[PDB]
Amino acid sequence: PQITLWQRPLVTIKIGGQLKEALLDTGADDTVLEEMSLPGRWKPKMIGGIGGFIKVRQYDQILIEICGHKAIGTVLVGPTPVNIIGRNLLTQIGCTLNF
């Protein structure tokens, strides 16, 4: 699909058997999801944004279906205010910016 930006670019994702809404975020290097139950091992990490830093759990090789496109990669889980699909996954679904 082609998505204009008059509204937030939200998509429906399926991850860990659950359905969520997430922002397609070209400004985010990594993918960061609100607290949720994800299976398996993880490593603690700290990531920085506009207001400071948050502690997240880093999960590798996680499968996500983003608007019907499958991708596998790192997903950070923690106290983000919004679910964010970052560039590590946007590249896998072939997402580009155009103007």
Q: How far is the CB of 35 from a second copy (least distance, A)?
A: 14
Cβ contacts of 27 within 8 Å, gap of 6 or more: none
| Rounded Cα–Cα distance for residues 39 and 80 (Å) | 19
Block residue for tokens 């998509």: 11
Active site residue 29: no
C-beta of 17 vs 87, nearer to ligand FQ4: 87
| Rounded Cα–Cα distance for residues 97 and 56 (Å) | 28
C-beta of 27 vs 68, nearer to ligand FQ4: 27
| 13, 15, 25, 85: residue in contact with ligand FQ4 (rule CB under 6 A) | 25
81 binds ligand FQ4 (CB under 6 A): yes
Binding positions for a second copy, rule: CB under 8 A = 1-6, 8-9, 23-29, 32, 47-54, 67, 69, 80-82, 84, 87, 90-91, 93-99
Rounded to 5°, the CA angle 17-48-37 comes to 20
| 22, 32, 71, 89: residue in contact with ligand FQ4 (rule CB under 6 A) | 32
Q: How are beta strands 69-77 and 31-33 bridged, if at all?
A: parallel
Active site residues: 25
